[PDB]
Each structure stands twice: as C-alpha cells, then as structure tokens.
Design an enzyme around this catalytic site. Structure first.
Site, short mmCIF file in Angstrom:
data_model
loop_
_atom_site.label_atom_id
_atom_site.label_comp_id
_atom_site.label_asym_id
_atom_site.label_seq_id
_atom_site.Cartn_x
_atom_site.Cartn_y
_atom_site.Cartn_z
N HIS A 120 -0.70 -4.24 16.92
CA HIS A 120 0.13 -4.39 18.11
C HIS A 120 1.41 -5.14 17.71
CE1 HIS A 120 -2.49 -2.60 21.04
NE2 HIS A 120 -3.50 -3.12 20.36
N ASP A 150 7.58 -3.84 20.06
CA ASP A 150 7.48 -2.66 20.92
C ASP A 150 8.83 -2.12 21.42
OD1 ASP A 150 4.75 -2.66 20.58
OD2 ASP A 150 4.25 -3.54 22.51
#
Ligand SMILES: CC(=O)CC(=O)SCCNC(=O)CCNC(=O)[C@H](O)C(C)(C)COP(=O)(O)OP(=O)(O)OC[C@H]1O[C@@H](n2cnc3c(N)ncnc32)[C@H](O)[C@@H]1OP(=O)(O)O
Ligand SMILES: CC(=O)CC(=O)SCCNC(=O)CCNC(=O)[C@H](O)C(C)(C)COP(=O)(O)OP(=O)(O)OC[C@H]1O[C@@H](n2cnc3c(N)ncnc32)[C@H](O)[C@@H]1OP(=O)(O)O
EC number: 5.1.99.4
Lengths: 354, 354
Positions: A120, A150
């Site tokens: 992540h 992200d």
C-alpha cells in the site's frame, strides 16, 4: 463538457490510484466505462458508467475485448501478470486495437524483485526516502495519509502518462504502454528535495529542515482556543509582515534564519499565537502578505469565504465533494455526475459501435 | 525522445509548482525554454534552455511575445494580474497565438478574496482541511513537506490541464486558459477522504483513522536499532502474513479491527518489532505479502535492490536524482540533460523560426 469530451476510457475496477485517475478523466469530460466483478455510495465513482463481467469466463473476456477495441485508454491496477493471465495483456489488446493507451498503475512497477509483492501507499514511500522525512524529529515517521504514493505520485503520474501518450499518438497514429509505478512517481514528486540534498540545502534529519516543520516560520501554531494557524512566511518581507501583525519588535527577536536560536524564536512566536484564538489571527492578518492562514478542519471548510466564492466544492447528496480541477476557460468541466445503477455491457457496445 | 517530443513550452521563471511542471514536460521530451530575470546547480532546472529578458522593457516584451508566438504552452506562476500588467496576459497572447495553452499556476486561484495574498504550500493546504488531518493526534499538525500543495495538488494538476487542453485542441484548433490553483488540485487529490467522510469512513479527528497513523496495521514501528519499518497490512490475508512473520499467535491478539483494543494491539506489535533491527525485518519480510518494508533515509535509497534494478535514480552531479516518470514502452524518455549555460534569446527564435 470539459476538455476530454470524446475520450473513451475502459477502467478495470481496482483500488486507490486507478479509480482516482479514472475519476479525473471523467471529471474532465471523458466517457469512462468501469468493469467490475459480477448504486454505489462512493463519490469517487462519480462520472462513470458501471458494468459487470466475469473476466475469467469466455463470454466475459470476449465482451471486455470488444469494449477495449473501441476505447482510447485502458486502466488496470492489478499485480503485473494478472491481465496477461486473463487474456487482456497489452499484447492481446494490440491485436484488437493498436491505438490503445494501455495504462498500468502499480506501486513497485512491472519488473524488479518486488514487482510481485503486495503493498500500500506507506510501503511504496518507505523505500524511496519519503516517509522517513515526514513528521516531528523526536518521534517515528507519520504517514501523510495516502496522498503521496496513491495520488500525487500515483494516479497523477498515470494521468500525465496517458495524456502525454495521447499527444504522441496525434503524430504516430499508435498507442503504447504506460508503466506508472508509485515508487517512481513519488520520487519525481519529491525531486526538489533530491536537488536540495545535492547542494547542502536539505538534510536527512527528520523535522530539522525548512519545509518539514523544523523552521519557526514554516509550521503550525496552536492558538488560545486549541485550534491552529499555519505560518509560511519564508521571504523576509513576508516574515516582517508576520512579525508586524503580531506586534513583535524585530530588534528583540533572533534573526529569522539563525538556526542556533530557532528554539528561542519558536518559543516567542508560540507565546504570541497562544495569546488569542485562531479567528483573531484571521482578522489581524486580513489582506496581508504575512502568509498566516487558519488551519480549517474538513467540516468547517464549506464556511470559508474563499472556498465558497470559487465553488471549490459542491454538495453531493449527503455532503461536500471537490469540484473538478484544474479549471478551463473555454471548455469548462461540468459538475460531476453522481454514481448510478449498473448498466448492461451490450448497451455500452451499441453506443460505442463495438 | 519521450512522448512529448516536439512540444514547445515557454516557462516564465517562478518557484515551486511552475518549475516542477516544466521539468516534467522536459523530462518527457518537450522543448522547454525558461525566461528568467536578467550554469545552475539546481537539478530541477534540468531539461531546459535558459534565456534572459527584462520583461518590463519594450525589447524584452517584444522578444518574449515572438517566442510565445511559436509555442504550444506558456507556464506562469505569478500573482493574478502580473502577466496582465506586463502585456503578457491571455488576451495579449491570444492576439499572436490563439493555439497557445495558457497555464496559470497559483495557490488561491485567479479570483476571490485571497487571490492577491502571498502564500506557500502550508497555507494552501491549511484552508481546505488537508493540513489539519496530518500528524499525531496529541500534537499540532505537521506539514507533509511541500508535497501536497506545490506538487501533488499543484504542478501535477497544471500538467493534467496542459495535456488535456492539448487533446481538446486537436479538434477545436484552439487553445485556452488553464487555471490551476493548489487549493483546488489538492482538494481533488484528497477526494477519497471527502468521499469517506460522507459514509462514516473517515473522521475529522487527527491521528484516529485507518490511513493517518491511527491504525496499528497502517503505521511505522521503531526497531531495536532505532530505525523504522512501515506496516501497511490492511487486508486480512496480508495482516495474517505479517503476524506469521512476527511469530505472533493470532489467537492471543485482539482482533485486527477491534478499535477499542487498538492500543493493546499496537503495544504487542511494538514489542515484536522492537526485538530486532530494521534490517532483520527487512529480510524476514523481503518477499512476502505482509506489507512490511524498511523505512529508508534518502542516503540509503541508492543501495536498495528494487531501486537499483529499475533505475528509479541516476547520478547527476554529486548526487542521485529521480529518472523521468512514468515510463513509456515505445517512446521512452532520455536521461535528463543537466542545467547548462544561459543562451541568447535570438538563438532560440532562429531555431523556432520566430
Ligand atoms: S491502494 C494501492 C494498493 N496497491 C496497488 O494497487 C498496486 C498494484 N496491485 C497490487 O499489488 C494488488 O492488486 C493488491 C496488493 C492491491 C491486491 O492483491 P490481490 O488481492 O492478491 O489481487 P491481484 O494479485 O491484483 O489479483 C486480482 C485477481 O482478481 C481477478 N479479477 C479482477 N477483476 C476481475 C473480474 N472482473 N472478473 C474476474 N476476475 C477478476 C484477476 O484475474 C486476478 O486473479 P488471479 O490472482 O487468478 O490472476
Ligand atoms: C517556495 C516553497 O518552498 C513553497 C511554495 O509553495 S512555492 C509557491 C509560492 N506560491 C505561488 O507561487 C502562488 C503564485 N505566486 C505568488 O503568490 C507570488 O509570485 C509569490 C507570493 C510567490 C511571490 O510574490 P512576489 O515576490 O511579490 O511576486 P509577484 O507578485 O508574483 O510579482 C513578480 C514581479 O516580478 C516581475 N517579473 C517576473 N519575471 C520578470 C522578468 N523576467 N523581468 C521583469 N520582471 C519580471 C513581474 O513584472 C512582477 O512585478 P510587479 O509586482 O510590478 O507586477
């Protein structure tokens, strides 16, 4: 109605960077069709048509390829090799559509020793020096949400790759593959610190630099009500404006850039800001170049005059969401279309003629 | 040699987002010409031609307009009104080049009550709820460097607007103005948190959410040697791989998502990670899906195998810099050209046929 009106995009449903890039394309006018596994409350899924397909079935694969054959762009954010296995790899798509911009959104990239490893945002910015540089010096690093891997270093680079590849295609007539790795994007995102490190203008010590909270003139301060202001008065004329508003005599303070006396300087500014509430400082610094602003929590943002007057947000059944960015003078983006009922894939194909 | 080969860009020298946007365009192959006030050690000014002009003089304005007449894009990052007073505003440029993409990079936008006020990254993200959300809960907010306003929500939205407007131009034959405000871009950058707030999935309490450090499975931990790892094991199968690597019995720990026992869970994870050095955990988790990664300082990055193998960085001058992102399979970007000497403006015009 934005500048990407007419652009066709197939999005293979994933998480994090992929749907955010597809949202921005749709925000700007693109015709975005999202394929999920067989009415969302997720505002991120604004500005789509949603369809479903079992990509592992013969029928599902066939239908996806028909759609892709009529698309300008394909976005996928699975492990490297996942689309290959499905029969939807770049080589298979090229057979049906060599104009296709095949956009691959990952953390680690398409190859390398970690290319098959889960992760992540926090993992991707851990390996490239970014996380280590975030937070107070006397504590372990804190994640800057998932904003840097992200989105700033992830979906935004995927978007630049896609739109750049579309420009290239104007002249070559052909598409290609965009490999957007968050570990790469976020490194270019922080290029400034890499440049400064080379000239002695940034150090690897967390919390001890000009832009990381180490500088008394570039940080937040807690006010009398327990709320905060942000001070960003780097240039000497703006810093002077800041001291002027606080009513502090420059002759009685440490020099702005005497780092040996930064704690003394910070203590004096802290006492000053603590003497009144946050909203007091908004009044004091009205139309000044002091670079002093209120630190607003999400739920107070919609009451800020500058936010209201520019329509930075809209009310989406339930709550506020950000309007499309950036803005265009002639082909302005519309207010986003909310998520809607799933529709039949064949309906989309008729529309697209596929 | 990247996808933007052939694209002509005039950059009016500024700070922060503007030069970063122009850098990326150059990285990807654009022909970028920066006009500065009358050889740089600033790696960010890579992939440019630097020229000089007093834009306040008759001659300098004339020369700037001849250059802009031949460009695809113009980047400016001054206060609203500044280029207008110069005779370089959108309306003036449109008289010499109606295909020009006019890209305006600011914090507050082109209008509104704050539009004339000086500021830097920390101010732009203070007003829209972002800064308030960054840092530990028991402390005032910490700036995530200038990563979120200047770059993720700044230069990258300028880039998306420039390249999107270039797409629209294919069909209209005309340019337009791109208004990229860091207050807007950074809001779209954090759209996921706005979406989550609407559904009860994110709160305004700093440090108490899934992705801000509040969750024991999404945070850094200090190891026996005072160095850190990042844990990002959100999904249960990844979390289980983490506990397996730690040798912890799941039966003996609180449930992963029992927030009431998060302190207890974090205390057990803290004791585990504290028992060996960072590089021990690096080894233990090097290949699994546990989402555990060593937190590398800038100076260590160049030694990390995944970084090395993918050529994420190159050696520029006494230091690593990030290679261009993202990557393209057919028209790959070159290694960036370092800053070189200023050249004569007429030399550029000769070249561009100005
Ligand atoms: S938030 C940012 C998180 N990180 C990233 O996005 C980086 C890139 N992606 C990844 O690393 C991974 O997708 C992840 C770690 C996020 C998740 O890993 P995962 O849950 O094991 O999924 P992943 O390895 O991508 O596999 C997806 C599977 O679902 C399938 N799938 C996806 N859409 C489908 C559909 N519509 N129909 C049928 N199957 C589908 C695929 O075929 C693939 O199956 P296989 O494992 O048999 O090849
Ligand atoms: C830097 C960091 O660490 C963090 C960051 O966030 S950087 C981002 C800073 N914020 C922004 O860029 C938002 C947009 N810009 C601004 O707000 C402002 O430029 C600023 C606050 C950053 C600087 O304020 P400023 O020094 O008063 O500059 P500004 O008001 O833009 O004016 C520039 C002047 O230089 C001139 N100028 C620029 N290039 C010139 C040239 N080649 N020849 C002659 N004049 C030139 C202009 O004519 C203008 O003059 P006037 O005031 O007479 O109109």
């Amino acid at each position: 109605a934005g500048p990407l009106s007419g652009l066709r995009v197939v999005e293979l449903a994933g998480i994090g960077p992929g749907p955010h890039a597809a949202m921005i394309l749709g925000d700007l006018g693109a015709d975005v069709v999202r394929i999920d596994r067989p009415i969302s409350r997720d505002a991120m899924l604004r500005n789509r048509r949603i369809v479903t397909a079992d990509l592992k079935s013969d029928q599902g694969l066939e239908l996806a390829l028909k759609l892709i054959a009529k698309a300008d762009v394909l976005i996928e954010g699975y492990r490297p090799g996942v689309t290959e296995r499905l029969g939807l790899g770049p080589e298979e798509c090229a057979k049906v559509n060599d104009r296709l911009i095949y956009a691959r959104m990952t953390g680690w990239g398409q190859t390398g020793p970690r290319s098959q490893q889960a992760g992540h945002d926090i993992n991707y910015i851990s390996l490239n020096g970014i996380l280590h540089a975030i937070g107070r010096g006397d504590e372990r690093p804190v994640p800057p949400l998932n904003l840097v891997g992200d989105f700033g270093g992830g979906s935004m680079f995927l978007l630049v790759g896609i739109l750049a590849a579309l420009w290239e295609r104007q002249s070559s007539g052909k598409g290609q593959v965009v490999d957007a790795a968050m570990v790469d994007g976020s490194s270019v995102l922080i290029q400034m610190m890499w440049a400064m490190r080379a000239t002695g203008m940034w150090t690897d010590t967390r919390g001890a630099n000009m832009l990381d909270g180490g500088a008394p003139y570039y940080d937040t301060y807690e006010c009398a009500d327990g709320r905060y202001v942000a001070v960003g008065a780097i240039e000497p004329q703006f810093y002077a404006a800041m001291l002027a508003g606080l009513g502090l005599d420059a002759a009685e303070l440490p020099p702005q850039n005497d780092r040996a006396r930064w704690p003394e300087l910070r203590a004096l500014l802290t006492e000053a800001f603590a003497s009144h509430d946050r909203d007091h400082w908004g009044a004091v610094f009205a139309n000044s170049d002091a670079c002093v602003t209120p630190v607003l929590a999400f739920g107070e943002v919609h009451n800020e005059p500058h936010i209201i007057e520019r329509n930075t947000f809209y009310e989406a059944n339930g709550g506020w969401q950000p309007m499309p960015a950036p803005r265009f003078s002639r082909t302005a983006s519309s207010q986003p279309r909310p998520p809607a009922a799933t529709i039949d894939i064949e309906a989309v194909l008729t529309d697209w003629d596929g």
